[PDB]
Amino acid sequence: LHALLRDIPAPDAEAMARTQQHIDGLLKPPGSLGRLETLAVQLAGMPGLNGTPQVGEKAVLVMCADHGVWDEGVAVSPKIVTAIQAANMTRGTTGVCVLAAQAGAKVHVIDVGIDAEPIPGVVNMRVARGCGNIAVGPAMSRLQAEALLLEVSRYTCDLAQRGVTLFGVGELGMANTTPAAAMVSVFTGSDAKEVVGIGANLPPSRIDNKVDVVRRAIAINQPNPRDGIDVLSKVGGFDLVGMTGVMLGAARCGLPVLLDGFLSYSAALAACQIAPAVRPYLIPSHFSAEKGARIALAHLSMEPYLHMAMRLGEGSGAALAMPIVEAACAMFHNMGELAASNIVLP
Amino acid sequence: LHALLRDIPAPDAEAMARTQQHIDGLLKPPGSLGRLETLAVQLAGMPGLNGTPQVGEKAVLVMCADHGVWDEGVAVSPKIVTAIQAANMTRGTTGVCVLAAQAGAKVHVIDVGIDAEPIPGVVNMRVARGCGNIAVGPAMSRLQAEALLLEVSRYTCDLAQRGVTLFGVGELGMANTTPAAAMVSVFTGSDAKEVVGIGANLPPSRIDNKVDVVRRAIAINQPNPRDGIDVLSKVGGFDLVGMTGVMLGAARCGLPVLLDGFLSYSAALAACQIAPAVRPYLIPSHFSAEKGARIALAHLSMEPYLHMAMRLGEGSGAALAMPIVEAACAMFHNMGELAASNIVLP
Ligand SMILES: O=C(O)c1cccnc1
Ligand SMILES: O=C(O)c1cccnc1
Numbered sequence: 001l002h003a004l005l006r007d008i009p010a011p012d013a014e015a016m017a018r019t020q021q022h023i024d025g026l027l028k029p030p031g032s033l034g035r036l037e038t039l040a041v042q043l044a045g046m047p048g049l050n051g052t053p054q055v056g057e058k059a060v061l062v063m064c065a066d067h068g069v070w071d072e073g074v075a076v077s078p079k080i081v082t083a084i085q086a087a088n089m090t091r092g093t094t095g096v097c098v099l100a101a102q103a104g105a106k107v108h109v110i111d112v113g114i115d116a117e118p119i120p121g122v123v124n125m126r127v128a129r130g131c132g133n134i135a136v137g138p139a140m141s142r143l144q145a146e147a148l149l150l151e152v153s154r155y156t157c158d159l160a161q162r163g164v165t166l167f168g169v170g171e172l173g174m175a176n177t178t179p180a181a182a183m184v185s186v187f188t189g190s191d192a193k194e195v196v197g198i199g200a201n202l203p204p205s206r207i208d209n210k211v212d213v214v215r216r217a218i219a220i221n222q223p224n225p226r227d228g229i230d231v232l233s234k235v236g237g238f239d240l241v242g243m244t245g246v247m248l249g250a251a252r253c254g255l256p257v258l259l260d261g262f263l264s265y266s267a268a269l270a271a272c273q274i275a276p277a278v279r280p281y282l283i284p285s286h287f288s289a290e291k292g293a294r295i296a297l298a299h300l301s302m303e304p305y306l307h308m309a310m311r312l313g314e315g316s317g318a319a320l321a322m323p324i325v326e327a328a329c330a331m332f333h334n335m336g337e338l339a340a341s342n343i344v345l346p
Numbered sequence: 347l348h349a350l351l352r353d354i355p356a357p358d359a360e361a362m363a364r365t366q367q368h369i370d371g372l373l374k375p376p377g378s379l380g381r382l383e384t385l386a387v388q389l390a391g392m393p394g395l396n397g398t399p400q401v402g403e404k405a406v407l408v409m410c411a412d413h414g415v416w417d418e419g420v421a422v423s424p425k426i427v428t429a430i431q432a433a434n435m436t437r438g439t440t441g442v443c444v445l446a447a448q449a450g451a452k453v454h455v456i457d458v459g460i461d462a463e464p465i466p467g468v469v470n471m472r473v474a475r476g477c478g479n480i481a482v483g484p485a486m487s488r489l490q491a492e493a494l495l496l497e498v499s500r501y502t503c504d505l506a507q508r509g510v511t512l513f514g515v516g517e518l519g520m521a522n523t524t525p526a527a528a529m530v531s532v533f534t535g536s537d538a539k540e541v542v543g544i545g546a547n548l549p550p551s552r553i554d555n556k557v558d559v560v561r562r563a564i565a566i567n568q569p570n571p572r573d574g575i576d577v578l579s580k581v582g583g584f585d586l587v588g589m590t591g592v593m594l595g596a597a598r599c600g601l602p603v604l605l606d607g608f609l610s611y612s613a614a615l616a617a618c619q620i621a622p623a624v625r626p627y628l629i630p631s632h633f634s635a636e637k638g639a640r641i642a643l644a645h646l647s648m649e650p651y652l653h654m655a656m657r658l659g660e661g662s663g664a665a666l667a668m669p670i671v672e673a674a675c676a677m678f679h680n681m682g683e684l685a686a687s688n689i690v691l692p
Binding site: 081 | 378654677688
């Protein structure tokens, strides 16, 4: 693990300078394609990409797990929905499934801690049958967190060996917006009231209780904001841990990862805390409708491309942004050049 | 023309109610897919769509024309770029071409007033060799404007007869951000300083002159803000007119149109002024980097989906948003149902 973190490659400034120059020569006013240009250059700096903006195979990794905090009445969805939906993920009927198919991406469902019998067809990396209730103690042990990070990290880099060049991260876990909010509060230094949202249609009344639960989790566990693993293990969850693991894995592999929504932002804060070298590999997708999204994004210094008021999760926003990534590549490789048309701009 | 405007269909409230209900039953918390849901319902109300969110063939119509106002020093691109780029549109090397191909859309290049010899391969609907210089008089005659509207309108609806279900609008015309700004100022009641941008890399110094040119255009022509055709003919251009015509055509045909950037917003204001019935058929794509974009969008009451800081034009933003439209359709048709999984949410 220390190794892993040690070996995360820096971005290739040389490939990036070459990309920039190429882009500037394209058939358009310089910088006119804005964020599409910046993205392309960003991709070019990624070592696993072979010095150019490219997209080969695509995969969305969905981390599923249950949370003990569900018992605190912080979620209106029945707990069993985690297991049901995970199964549905196998049949291609879920939101992420439909969107991924549209993007030509494959979905990998990973069980990191569902509180139910094993689901056939789902990748088994189960830590336990749901994590501890963060309101009265830690979600899991440091060991458990570190092990899972390692395991998902490897699984991720391994997919690279098989042609995957672009990853997307997602989750599934009833009540997971609670630990997500706690992490955000901790890493950001924001008060819980500011970052706690309605999650999956939590009624406005019930909010207060959610905020109190978050506060309790923090007071009780005293996670250290300077230690991302500390935070994850104390006030996070298996699903959140697995997401951070995908990010660590892609980075080590020198490949890009598309974030999803709120849950993903929380995992991204932790990953960046654990290894700042991770940052350049992350790509935002959309702007989550969750209340604490703006704050989380600000701390990551990211501006998402899509404003869809989405708040489903599962990696649906990541899938939806994949075509954008491919567009930056198409632009880069298929557009004609100014010089060739004899166009000279001041 | 009065006919045409007369026959624009209202949206189908019945299909819309049916869509909403179907969406609510999908495998996700209600309203969790946000804007993707709203879009789907919007499409379902479009009569040319057959009561459901569907996307058959896609087309981007690019209206090319030159402007006499170029002589006022309001643009740094050589005038000839309009003709060059129009030709390039035929070879598939431009920005819109590359993006449309990625979206599986076909690009139709239409010459409505390029100041050069006819370009083989380009649809010929040329009004004149560039429009009049709005700084000292009107861009064209009311007759000319009305005729072009009619002609493009028909061309548009005709494509429908051949399987096109989704249109995208674009333009190409050196100096066109000047008339675009004038229209925006007029329709919005905003002062020119607020809506005049740098267009295609106009140097900061040169701005002042651009603002003065806009003001002059307005003082001199006295366009009537309550008459969209009046405004288009006086302080618009052929390209702008053609774009409005596509919008009128799609609406009459009861089909959706994806807007592009700043130039497109200006055309949309005019179309809406001419026929409010047009509004429900319009779909924003991205948030143009042009200074006056926020104001124009506010008046159209639209919030774009994409924030890419783009400012190329040609219909590139429209092409980039097409996958989003298809996503709303995929969601609608391919997702599983709550009831089927025995999921009950309060
Ligand atoms: O932003 C998300 O991904 C999200 C928000 C609420 C509930 N589930 C997921
Ligand atoms: O927003 C646009 O479409 C645009 C802005 C500047 C120059 N050309 C096009």
